[PDB]
Design an enzyme around this catalytic site. Sequence first.
Site, PDB file in Angstrom:
ATOM      1  N   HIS A  54       0.837  -1.209   0.000  1.00 38.14           N
ATOM      2  CA  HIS A  54       0.000   0.000   0.000  1.00 38.14           C
ATOM      3  C   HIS A  54       0.875   1.264   0.000  1.00 38.14           C
ATOM      4  O   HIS A  54       0.539   2.241  -0.674  1.00 38.14           O
ATOM      5  CB  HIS A  54      -1.001  -0.062   1.174  1.00 38.14           C
ATOM      6  CG  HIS A  54      -1.824   1.173   1.388  1.00 38.14           C
ATOM      7  ND1 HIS A  54      -1.706   1.920   2.545  1.00 38.14           N
ATOM      8  CD2 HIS A  54      -2.760   1.742   0.596  1.00 38.14           C
ATOM      9  CE1 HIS A  54      -2.558   2.925   2.416  1.00 38.14           C
ATOM     10  NE2 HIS A  54      -3.207   2.867   1.257  1.00 38.14           N
ATOM     11  N   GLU A  57       2.293   1.800  -3.532  1.00 37.88           N
ATOM     12  CA  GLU A  57       1.206   2.343  -4.354  1.00 37.88           C
ATOM     13  C   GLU A  57       1.143   3.880  -4.273  1.00 37.88           C
ATOM     14  O   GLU A  57       1.117   4.543  -5.301  1.00 37.88           O
ATOM     15  CB  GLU A  57      -0.124   1.700  -3.935  1.00 37.88           C
ATOM     16  CG  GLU A  57      -1.332   2.150  -4.746  1.00 37.88           C
ATOM     17  CD  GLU A  57      -2.434   2.689  -3.859  1.00 37.88           C
ATOM     18  OE1 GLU A  57      -2.727   3.899  -3.939  1.00 37.88           O
ATOM     19  OE2 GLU A  57      -2.982   1.906  -3.053  1.00 37.88           O
ATOM     20  N   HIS A  58       1.177   4.427  -3.051  1.00 37.32           N
ATOM     21  CA  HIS A  58       1.214   5.867  -2.793  1.00 37.32           C
ATOM     22  C   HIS A  58       2.484   6.513  -3.389  1.00 37.32           C
ATOM     23  O   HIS A  58       2.416   7.610  -3.946  1.00 37.32           O
ATOM     24  CB  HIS A  58       1.154   6.124  -1.273  1.00 37.32           C
ATOM     25  CG  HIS A  58      -0.238   6.118  -0.726  1.00 37.32           C
ATOM     26  ND1 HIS A  58      -0.825   7.273  -0.258  1.00 37.32           N
ATOM     27  CD2 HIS A  58      -1.126   5.103  -0.612  1.00 37.32           C
ATOM     28  CE1 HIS A  58      -2.040   6.929   0.132  1.00 37.32           C
ATOM     29  NE2 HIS A  58      -2.269   5.636  -0.064  1.00 37.32           N
ATOM     30  N   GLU A 134       4.846  10.830   2.816  1.00 36.98           N
ATOM     31  CA  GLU A 134       3.787   9.830   2.728  1.00 36.98           C
ATOM     32  C   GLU A 134       3.510   9.084   4.042  1.00 36.98           C
ATOM     33  O   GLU A 134       2.404   8.565   4.197  1.00 36.98           O
ATOM     34  CB  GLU A 134       4.021   8.836   1.572  1.00 36.98           C
ATOM     35  CG  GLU A 134       3.617   9.366   0.212  1.00 36.98           C
ATOM     36  CD  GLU A 134       2.211   9.908   0.054  1.00 36.98           C
ATOM     37  OE1 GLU A 134       1.239   9.164   0.325  1.00 36.98           O
ATOM     38  OE2 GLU A 134       2.086  11.080  -0.364  1.00 36.98           O
TER      39      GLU A 134
END
Length: 469
Positions: A54, A57-58, A134
Amino acid sequence: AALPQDEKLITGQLDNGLRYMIYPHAHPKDQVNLWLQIHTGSLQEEDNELGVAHFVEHMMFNGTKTWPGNKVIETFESMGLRFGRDVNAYTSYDETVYQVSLPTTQKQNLQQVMAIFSEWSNAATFEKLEVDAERGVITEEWRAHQDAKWRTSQARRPFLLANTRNLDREPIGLMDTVATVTPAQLRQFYQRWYQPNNMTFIVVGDIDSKEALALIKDNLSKLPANKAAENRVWPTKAENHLRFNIINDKENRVNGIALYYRLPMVQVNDEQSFIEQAEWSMLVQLFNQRLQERIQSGELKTISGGTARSVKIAPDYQSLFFRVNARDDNMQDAANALMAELATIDQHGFSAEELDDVKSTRLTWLKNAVDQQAERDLRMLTSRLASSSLNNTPFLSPEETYQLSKRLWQQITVQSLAEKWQQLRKNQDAFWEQMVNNEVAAKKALSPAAILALEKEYANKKLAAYVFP
Ligand SMILES: [Cl-]
Ligand SMILES: [Cl-]
Protein backbone atom coordinates in the site's frame (compact mmCIF):
# COMPACT_ATOMS: atom_id res chain seq x y z
CA ALA A 1 -14.35 -28.48 -21.04
CA ALA A 2 -12.80 -24.90 -21.01
CA LEU A 3 -15.07 -21.84 -21.35
CA PRO A 4 -14.42 -19.37 -24.25
CA GLN A 5 -13.63 -15.71 -23.55
CA ASP A 6 -15.64 -12.87 -25.19
CA GLU A 7 -15.07 -12.87 -28.94
CA LYS A 8 -14.32 -9.04 -28.88
CA LEU A 9 -11.64 -9.38 -26.12
CA ILE A 10 -8.02 -9.04 -27.28
CA THR A 11 -5.46 -10.82 -25.02
CA GLY A 12 -1.75 -11.45 -25.35
CA GLN A 13 1.73 -10.92 -24.02
CA LEU A 14 4.65 -8.68 -25.05
CA ASP A 15 8.11 -10.43 -25.44
CA ASN A 16 9.13 -8.98 -22.03
CA GLY A 17 6.25 -10.98 -20.41
CA LEU A 18 3.77 -8.11 -19.81
CA ARG A 19 0.17 -9.26 -20.46
CA TYR A 20 -2.53 -7.07 -22.01
CA MET A 21 -6.32 -7.14 -22.33
CA ILE A 22 -8.17 -4.87 -24.75
CA TYR A 23 -11.95 -4.54 -24.91
CA PRO A 24 -13.86 -2.08 -27.16
CA HIS A 25 -16.69 -0.02 -25.60
CA ALA A 26 -18.41 3.21 -26.70
CA HIS A 27 -20.55 4.13 -23.65
CA PRO A 28 -19.47 6.88 -22.98
CA LYS A 29 -18.22 7.65 -26.49
CA ASP A 30 -14.54 8.67 -26.90
CA GLN A 31 -13.70 7.49 -23.37
CA VAL A 32 -11.06 4.89 -22.38
CA ASN A 33 -9.93 3.28 -19.10
CA LEU A 34 -6.23 2.47 -18.85
CA TRP A 35 -5.46 0.27 -15.83
CA LEU A 36 -2.09 -1.18 -14.80
CA GLN A 37 -2.65 -4.31 -12.70
CA ILE A 38 0.14 -5.68 -10.47
CA HIS A 39 -0.74 -9.27 -9.52
CA THR A 40 0.62 -8.67 -5.97
CA GLY A 41 -1.03 -7.06 -2.94
CA SER A 42 -0.54 -7.27 0.85
CA LEU A 43 -0.68 -11.14 0.99
CA GLN A 44 2.94 -11.38 -0.33
CA GLU A 45 4.41 -9.01 2.31
CA GLU A 46 7.03 -10.45 4.70
CA ASP A 47 6.52 -10.08 8.53
CA ASN A 48 8.66 -6.88 8.46
CA GLU A 49 6.73 -5.43 5.42
CA LEU A 50 3.17 -4.95 6.83
CA GLY A 51 1.54 -2.20 4.70
CA VAL A 52 4.47 -1.92 2.25
CA ALA A 53 2.37 -2.95 -0.83
CA HIS A 54 0.00 0.00 0.00
CA PHE A 55 2.95 2.36 0.81
CA VAL A 56 4.58 1.46 -2.62
CA GLU A 57 1.21 2.34 -4.35
CA HIS A 58 1.21 5.87 -2.79
CA MET A 59 4.89 6.33 -3.83
CA MET A 60 3.95 6.06 -7.56
CA PHE A 61 2.45 9.57 -7.35
CA ASN A 62 5.50 11.06 -5.58
CA GLY A 63 8.43 10.63 -7.98
CA THR A 64 9.72 8.83 -11.08
CA LYS A 65 12.97 9.24 -13.11
CA THR A 66 11.42 11.77 -15.59
CA TRP A 67 8.82 13.20 -13.14
CA PRO A 68 10.38 13.73 -9.63
CA GLY A 69 8.38 15.07 -6.64
CA ASN A 70 4.93 16.38 -7.64
CA LYS A 71 5.63 16.33 -11.44
CA VAL A 72 3.45 13.18 -12.14
CA ILE A 73 0.41 14.96 -10.57
CA GLU A 74 1.28 18.28 -12.32
CA THR A 75 1.50 16.40 -15.67
CA PHE A 76 -1.96 14.79 -15.13
CA GLU A 77 -3.37 18.21 -14.02
CA SER A 78 -2.04 19.85 -17.30
CA MET A 79 -4.25 17.34 -19.24
CA GLY A 80 -7.24 18.10 -16.96
CA LEU A 81 -6.90 14.78 -15.09
CA ARG A 82 -7.41 14.94 -11.31
CA PHE A 83 -6.32 12.52 -8.58
CA GLY A 84 -9.39 11.00 -6.89
CA ARG A 85 -11.52 11.74 -10.00
CA ASP A 86 -9.78 10.62 -13.29
CA VAL A 87 -6.63 9.16 -11.68
CA ASN A 88 -6.89 6.57 -8.87
CA ALA A 89 -5.07 3.57 -7.38
CA TYR A 90 -5.82 0.87 -4.81
CA THR A 91 -4.06 -1.95 -2.94
CA SER A 92 -5.95 -5.07 -1.88
CA TYR A 93 -4.89 -8.48 -0.53
CA ASP A 94 -4.45 -9.80 -4.11
CA GLU A 95 -3.34 -6.85 -6.26
CA THR A 96 -2.27 -3.23 -6.74
CA VAL A 97 -4.09 -1.39 -9.55
CA TYR A 98 -3.29 2.02 -11.17
CA GLN A 99 -6.22 3.66 -12.96
CA VAL A 100 -6.58 6.47 -15.52
CA SER A 101 -9.81 7.40 -17.43
CA LEU A 102 -9.40 10.02 -20.18
CA PRO A 103 -10.84 10.99 -23.62
CA THR A 104 -9.46 9.21 -26.73
CA THR A 105 -9.74 12.40 -28.89
CA GLN A 106 -6.35 13.99 -27.85
CA LYS A 107 -3.69 11.46 -29.04
CA GLN A 108 -0.70 13.30 -27.45
CA ASN A 109 -2.44 13.01 -24.02
CA LEU A 110 -2.98 9.24 -24.54
CA GLN A 111 0.79 8.99 -25.28
CA GLN A 112 1.71 11.13 -22.26
CA VAL A 113 -0.46 8.89 -19.94
CA MET A 114 1.24 5.74 -21.42
CA ALA A 115 4.71 7.30 -20.73
CA ILE A 116 3.68 7.75 -17.03
CA PHE A 117 2.53 4.05 -16.91
CA SER A 118 5.93 2.96 -18.35
CA GLU A 119 7.73 4.76 -15.43
CA TRP A 120 5.36 3.46 -12.74
CA SER A 121 6.36 -0.04 -14.05
CA ASN A 122 10.16 0.27 -13.26
CA ALA A 123 11.27 3.95 -12.78
CA ALA A 124 9.72 5.08 -9.41
CA THR A 125 12.48 6.83 -7.35
CA PHE A 126 11.34 6.69 -3.64
CA GLU A 127 13.03 10.03 -2.67
CA LYS A 128 13.70 10.21 1.12
CA LEU A 129 11.76 13.51 1.52
CA GLU A 130 8.74 12.08 -0.43
CA VAL A 131 8.71 8.80 1.57
CA ASP A 132 8.76 10.87 4.85
CA ALA A 133 5.83 12.97 3.53
CA GLU A 134 3.79 9.83 2.73
CA ARG A 135 4.26 8.36 6.28
CA GLY A 136 2.02 11.16 7.68
CA VAL A 137 -0.49 10.66 4.80
CA ILE A 138 -0.93 6.89 5.41
CA THR A 139 -1.12 7.41 9.25
CA GLU A 140 -3.97 9.98 8.72
CA GLU A 141 -5.85 7.74 6.22
CA TRP A 142 -5.57 4.79 8.68
CA ARG A 143 -7.40 6.85 11.38
CA ALA A 144 -9.96 8.45 8.95
CA HIS A 145 -11.37 5.12 7.61
CA GLN A 146 -12.08 3.79 11.20
CA ASP A 147 -15.93 4.25 10.96
CA ALA A 148 -18.88 1.92 12.01
CA LYS A 149 -18.47 -0.32 8.86
CA TRP A 150 -14.70 -0.71 9.65
CA ARG A 151 -15.35 -1.49 13.37
CA THR A 152 -18.04 -4.07 12.31
CA SER A 153 -15.56 -5.64 9.77
CA GLN A 154 -12.83 -5.68 12.49
CA ALA A 155 -15.21 -7.43 14.98
CA ARG A 156 -16.38 -10.00 12.32
CA ARG A 157 -12.79 -10.48 11.00
CA PRO A 158 -11.48 -13.28 13.36
CA PHE A 159 -14.65 -15.33 12.68
CA LEU A 160 -14.80 -14.69 8.92
CA LEU A 161 -11.05 -14.95 8.15
CA ALA A 162 -10.01 -17.83 10.49
CA ASN A 163 -7.07 -19.83 8.95
CA THR A 164 -6.55 -17.41 6.00
CA ARG A 165 -3.31 -15.53 5.13
CA ASN A 166 -5.76 -12.51 4.71
CA LEU A 167 -6.27 -12.49 8.53
CA ASP A 168 -2.59 -11.48 9.05
CA ARG A 169 -2.34 -9.18 5.96
CA GLU A 170 -4.86 -6.25 6.10
CA PRO A 171 -3.64 -3.85 3.28
CA ILE A 172 -3.16 -0.74 5.55
CA GLY A 173 -0.57 -2.78 7.54
CA LEU A 174 1.01 -1.47 10.79
CA MET A 175 1.62 2.23 11.59
CA ASP A 176 4.95 1.23 13.18
CA THR A 177 6.05 -0.23 9.79
CA VAL A 178 4.70 2.95 8.01
CA ALA A 179 6.82 5.12 10.42
CA THR A 180 10.14 3.11 10.16
CA VAL A 181 10.25 1.43 6.67
CA THR A 182 13.27 2.81 4.77
CA PRO A 183 13.15 4.06 1.13
CA ALA A 184 15.56 1.15 0.32
CA GLN A 185 13.08 -1.39 1.85
CA LEU A 186 10.17 0.12 -0.21
CA ARG A 187 12.44 -0.06 -3.32
CA GLN A 188 13.23 -3.74 -2.52
CA PHE A 189 9.50 -4.77 -2.48
CA TYR A 190 8.91 -2.69 -5.66
CA GLN A 191 11.80 -4.32 -7.61
CA ARG A 192 10.79 -7.81 -6.27
CA TRP A 193 7.15 -7.64 -7.51
CA TYR A 194 7.02 -4.84 -10.16
CA GLN A 195 8.45 -6.80 -13.12
CA PRO A 196 6.63 -7.31 -16.51
CA ASN A 197 5.63 -11.02 -16.06
CA ASN A 198 3.60 -10.02 -12.93
CA MET A 199 1.77 -7.22 -14.87
CA THR A 200 -1.37 -6.90 -17.00
CA PHE A 201 -2.17 -3.63 -18.80
CA ILE A 202 -6.00 -3.28 -19.32
CA VAL A 203 -7.54 -1.05 -22.08
CA VAL A 204 -11.40 -0.72 -22.02
CA GLY A 205 -13.10 1.90 -24.13
CA ASP A 206 -13.59 3.69 -27.43
CA ILE A 207 -10.35 2.83 -29.28
CA ASP A 208 -9.73 0.49 -32.25
CA SER A 209 -7.67 -2.77 -31.95
CA LYS A 210 -4.70 -1.41 -34.01
CA GLU A 211 -4.41 1.89 -32.09
CA ALA A 212 -4.79 0.22 -28.63
CA LEU A 213 -2.22 -2.54 -29.50
CA ALA A 214 0.18 0.15 -30.79
CA LEU A 215 -0.23 2.25 -27.54
CA ILE A 216 0.84 -0.80 -25.47
CA LYS A 217 3.67 -2.04 -27.74
CA ASP A 218 5.13 1.47 -28.39
CA ASN A 219 5.29 2.27 -24.66
CA LEU A 220 5.68 -0.97 -22.68
CA SER A 221 7.73 -3.38 -24.83
CA LYS A 222 11.06 -1.63 -23.94
CA LEU A 223 10.68 -2.57 -20.19
CA PRO A 224 13.52 -5.08 -19.39
CA ALA A 225 12.47 -8.77 -19.32
CA ASN A 226 13.05 -9.15 -15.55
CA LYS A 227 11.10 -11.93 -13.76
CA ALA A 228 9.19 -11.04 -10.57
CA ALA A 229 9.32 -13.35 -7.49
CA GLU A 230 6.64 -16.09 -7.52
CA ASN A 231 3.36 -15.19 -5.78
CA ARG A 232 2.89 -17.68 -2.93
CA VAL A 233 -0.51 -19.32 -2.24
CA TRP A 234 -1.76 -20.10 1.30
CA PRO A 235 -4.59 -22.73 1.19
CA THR A 236 -7.42 -21.83 3.62
CA LYS A 237 -8.05 -24.50 6.29
CA ALA A 238 -11.54 -25.33 7.60
CA GLU A 239 -12.37 -24.43 11.23
CA ASN A 240 -14.76 -27.26 12.23
CA HIS A 241 -16.29 -25.37 15.18
CA LEU A 242 -19.51 -23.41 15.54
CA ARG A 243 -18.84 -19.86 16.80
CA PHE A 244 -21.04 -17.08 18.20
CA ASN A 245 -20.65 -13.29 18.10
CA ILE A 246 -22.60 -10.16 19.10
CA ILE A 247 -21.50 -6.88 17.46
CA ASN A 248 -22.44 -3.96 19.69
CA ASP A 249 -22.01 -0.58 17.89
CA LYS A 250 -24.25 2.45 18.65
CA GLU A 251 -23.40 3.90 15.17
CA ASN A 252 -24.70 0.81 13.25
CA ARG A 253 -28.20 1.47 11.81
CA VAL A 254 -29.66 -2.10 11.50
CA ASN A 255 -30.17 -4.73 14.24
CA GLY A 256 -30.36 -8.39 13.21
CA ILE A 257 -29.19 -12.01 13.17
CA ALA A 258 -27.13 -13.92 10.60
CA LEU A 259 -25.76 -17.46 10.11
CA TYR A 260 -22.44 -17.58 8.19
CA TYR A 261 -21.01 -20.71 6.56
CA ARG A 262 -17.41 -20.79 5.21
CA LEU A 263 -16.57 -23.02 2.24
CA PRO A 264 -14.15 -23.39 -0.74
CA MET A 265 -14.71 -21.05 -3.66
CA VAL A 266 -14.46 -22.64 -7.14
CA GLN A 267 -13.02 -20.61 -10.00
CA VAL A 268 -15.41 -20.65 -13.02
CA ASN A 269 -13.14 -21.93 -15.85
CA ASP A 270 -15.19 -24.93 -17.19
CA GLU A 271 -18.76 -26.40 -17.43
CA GLN A 272 -18.67 -28.31 -14.08
CA SER A 273 -17.40 -25.21 -12.15
CA PHE A 274 -19.97 -22.97 -13.97
CA ILE A 275 -22.73 -25.33 -12.63
CA GLU A 276 -21.24 -25.42 -9.07
CA GLN A 277 -21.22 -21.58 -8.86
CA ALA A 278 -24.73 -21.35 -10.40
CA GLU A 279 -26.08 -23.78 -7.74
CA TRP A 280 -24.72 -21.67 -4.80
CA SER A 281 -26.05 -18.49 -6.51
CA MET A 282 -29.49 -20.10 -7.01
CA LEU A 283 -29.69 -21.36 -3.38
CA VAL A 284 -28.92 -17.74 -2.28
CA GLN A 285 -31.53 -16.28 -4.71
CA LEU A 286 -34.23 -18.85 -3.75
CA PHE A 287 -33.77 -17.97 -0.03
CA ASN A 288 -34.06 -14.21 -0.92
CA GLN A 289 -37.14 -14.89 -3.13
CA ARG A 290 -38.97 -16.85 -0.36
CA LEU A 291 -38.22 -14.23 2.36
CA GLN A 292 -39.35 -11.33 0.08
CA GLU A 293 -42.55 -13.26 -0.90
CA ARG A 294 -43.37 -13.83 2.83
CA ILE A 295 -42.71 -10.13 3.69
CA GLN A 296 -44.66 -8.64 0.73
CA SER A 297 -47.59 -11.09 1.23
CA GLY A 298 -47.85 -9.74 4.84
CA GLU A 299 -46.79 -12.97 6.65
CA LEU A 300 -43.63 -11.37 8.20
CA LYS A 301 -44.36 -7.90 9.63
CA THR A 302 -42.44 -8.87 12.86
CA ILE A 303 -39.16 -8.28 10.83
CA SER A 304 -37.93 -5.43 8.53
CA GLY A 305 -36.10 -7.46 5.86
CA GLY A 306 -33.15 -9.74 5.21
CA THR A 307 -30.81 -11.33 2.64
CA ALA A 308 -28.64 -14.32 1.68
CA ARG A 309 -25.28 -13.61 0.04
CA SER A 310 -21.95 -15.12 -0.92
CA VAL A 311 -18.72 -13.15 -0.28
CA LYS A 312 -15.05 -13.87 -1.24
CA ILE A 313 -12.97 -14.23 1.98
CA ALA A 314 -9.62 -15.47 0.50
CA PRO A 315 -8.39 -16.39 -3.11
CA ASP A 316 -9.68 -20.02 -2.60
CA TYR A 317 -12.58 -19.38 -0.17
CA GLN A 318 -16.01 -17.87 0.37
CA SER A 319 -18.70 -17.31 2.97
CA LEU A 320 -22.39 -17.90 2.42
CA PHE A 321 -24.52 -16.05 4.99
CA PHE A 322 -28.28 -15.89 5.76
CA ARG A 323 -29.44 -12.68 7.44
CA VAL A 324 -32.75 -11.41 8.89
CA ASN A 325 -32.99 -7.70 9.86
CA ALA A 326 -34.87 -6.98 13.10
CA ARG A 327 -37.87 -4.67 13.52
CA ASP A 328 -36.40 -2.14 16.04
CA ASP A 329 -34.92 -4.15 19.02
CA ASN A 330 -37.06 -7.30 18.49
CA MET A 331 -34.16 -9.82 18.39
CA GLN A 332 -36.47 -12.80 19.17
CA ASP A 333 -38.67 -12.19 16.08
CA ALA A 334 -35.58 -11.88 13.81
CA ALA A 335 -34.11 -15.16 15.18
CA ASN A 336 -37.58 -16.84 14.87
CA ALA A 337 -37.99 -15.75 11.19
CA LEU A 338 -34.45 -16.90 10.24
CA MET A 339 -34.65 -20.28 12.06
CA ALA A 340 -38.18 -20.95 10.67
CA GLU A 341 -37.05 -20.30 7.04
CA LEU A 342 -33.86 -22.41 7.35
CA ALA A 343 -35.79 -25.35 8.93
CA THR A 344 -38.60 -25.12 6.27
CA ILE A 345 -35.93 -25.54 3.47
CA ASP A 346 -34.29 -28.38 5.52
CA GLN A 347 -37.63 -30.26 5.53
CA HIS A 348 -39.08 -29.52 2.02
CA GLY A 349 -36.40 -27.73 -0.07
CA PHE A 350 -37.58 -25.72 -3.07
CA SER A 351 -40.47 -26.48 -5.43
CA ALA A 352 -40.15 -27.02 -9.21
CA GLU A 353 -42.18 -23.74 -9.76
CA GLU A 354 -39.84 -21.75 -7.45
CA LEU A 355 -36.71 -22.99 -9.35
CA ASP A 356 -38.45 -22.51 -12.77
CA ASP A 357 -39.22 -18.87 -11.83
CA VAL A 358 -35.58 -18.16 -10.73
CA LYS A 359 -34.24 -19.62 -14.06
CA SER A 360 -36.81 -17.85 -16.37
CA THR A 361 -36.35 -14.39 -14.70
CA ARG A 362 -32.51 -14.72 -14.81
CA LEU A 363 -32.62 -15.84 -18.48
CA THR A 364 -34.95 -12.86 -19.31
CA TRP A 365 -32.33 -10.53 -17.70
CA LEU A 366 -29.46 -12.34 -19.49
CA LYS A 367 -31.23 -12.06 -22.86
CA ASN A 368 -31.84 -8.30 -22.27
CA ALA A 369 -28.12 -7.96 -21.19
CA VAL A 370 -27.11 -9.25 -24.68
CA ASP A 371 -29.45 -6.70 -26.37
CA GLN A 372 -28.23 -3.80 -24.17
CA GLN A 373 -24.47 -4.77 -24.02
CA ALA A 374 -23.34 -1.61 -25.90
CA GLU A 375 -24.77 0.47 -22.97
CA ARG A 376 -22.89 -1.30 -20.11
CA ASP A 377 -21.31 0.88 -17.38
CA LEU A 378 -17.64 1.40 -18.41
CA ARG A 379 -16.29 1.23 -14.81
CA MET A 380 -18.23 -2.02 -13.96
CA LEU A 381 -17.12 -3.65 -17.26
CA THR A 382 -13.44 -2.65 -16.58
CA SER A 383 -13.74 -4.10 -13.01
CA ARG A 384 -15.20 -7.45 -14.29
CA LEU A 385 -12.30 -7.78 -16.80
CA ALA A 386 -9.75 -6.91 -14.03
CA SER A 387 -11.38 -9.63 -11.86
CA SER A 388 -11.12 -12.24 -14.70
CA SER A 389 -7.46 -11.27 -15.09
CA LEU A 390 -6.75 -11.59 -11.34
CA ASN A 391 -8.46 -15.02 -11.05
CA ASN A 392 -7.22 -16.37 -14.45
CA THR A 393 -10.86 -17.17 -15.36
CA PRO A 394 -12.35 -16.65 -18.84
CA PHE A 395 -14.14 -13.29 -19.33
CA LEU A 396 -17.50 -14.49 -20.77
CA SER A 397 -19.44 -12.29 -23.19
CA PRO A 398 -23.15 -11.50 -22.45
CA GLU A 399 -23.98 -13.92 -25.36
CA GLU A 400 -21.83 -16.80 -23.95
CA THR A 401 -23.26 -16.17 -20.42
CA TYR A 402 -26.82 -16.39 -21.85
CA GLN A 403 -26.16 -19.56 -24.02
CA LEU A 404 -24.20 -21.33 -21.18
CA SER A 405 -27.00 -20.59 -18.65
CA LYS A 406 -29.75 -21.82 -21.07
CA ARG A 407 -27.82 -25.10 -21.58
CA LEU A 408 -25.97 -25.83 -18.28
CA TRP A 409 -28.81 -24.78 -15.89
CA GLN A 410 -30.88 -27.79 -17.12
CA GLN A 411 -28.45 -29.90 -14.96
CA ILE A 412 -29.67 -27.85 -11.90
CA THR A 413 -32.71 -29.55 -10.32
CA VAL A 414 -34.80 -29.35 -7.14
CA GLN A 415 -32.97 -32.66 -6.25
CA SER A 416 -29.45 -31.34 -7.05
CA LEU A 417 -30.13 -28.24 -4.90
CA ALA A 418 -31.58 -30.38 -2.02
CA GLU A 419 -28.26 -32.30 -2.04
CA LYS A 420 -26.23 -29.03 -1.93
CA TRP A 421 -28.49 -27.56 0.80
CA GLN A 422 -28.06 -30.70 2.98
CA GLN A 423 -24.24 -30.49 2.47
CA LEU A 424 -24.15 -26.77 3.39
CA ARG A 425 -26.27 -27.41 6.51
CA LYS A 426 -23.85 -30.15 7.75
CA ASN A 427 -20.86 -27.75 7.31
CA GLN A 428 -19.10 -27.43 10.71
CA ASP A 429 -17.35 -24.18 9.65
CA ALA A 430 -20.04 -21.79 10.79
CA PHE A 431 -20.84 -18.85 13.07
CA TRP A 432 -23.96 -17.12 14.44
CA GLU A 433 -23.88 -13.34 14.56
CA GLN A 434 -26.12 -10.67 16.07
CA MET A 435 -25.83 -6.91 15.55
CA VAL A 436 -27.09 -4.52 18.27
CA ASN A 437 -26.99 -0.67 18.43
CA ASN A 438 -28.58 0.10 21.85
CA GLU A 439 -28.83 -1.56 25.28
CA VAL A 440 -32.52 -2.60 24.71
CA ALA A 441 -31.54 -4.73 21.62
CA ALA A 442 -28.31 -5.80 23.50
CA LYS A 443 -30.44 -7.13 26.41
CA LYS A 444 -32.80 -8.72 23.79
CA ALA A 445 -29.97 -10.51 21.86
CA LEU A 446 -30.11 -14.32 22.15
CA SER A 447 -27.24 -16.06 24.00
CA PRO A 448 -25.75 -19.18 22.19
CA ALA A 449 -27.81 -21.73 24.21
CA ALA A 450 -31.07 -19.89 23.32
CA ILE A 451 -30.12 -19.81 19.58
CA LEU A 452 -29.57 -23.60 19.49
CA ALA A 453 -32.70 -24.34 21.62
CA LEU A 454 -34.67 -22.34 19.01
CA GLU A 455 -33.03 -24.39 16.22
CA LYS A 456 -33.91 -27.68 17.98
CA GLU A 457 -37.53 -26.42 18.51
CA TYR A 458 -37.86 -25.73 14.72
CA ALA A 459 -35.99 -28.95 13.71
CA ASN A 460 -38.54 -31.08 15.70
CA LYS A 461 -41.59 -29.19 14.28
CA LYS A 462 -43.59 -30.69 11.37
CA LEU A 463 -43.41 -27.45 9.30
CA ALA A 464 -45.57 -26.97 6.16
CA ALA A 465 -44.19 -26.85 2.59
CA TYR A 466 -44.01 -23.40 1.06
CA VAL A 467 -46.27 -22.83 -1.97
CA PHE A 468 -45.06 -20.51 -4.78
CA PRO A 469 -47.87 -17.96 -5.59
CL1 LIG B 1 -6.82 -2.03 4.87
CL1 LIG C 1 -18.95 -27.23 16.94
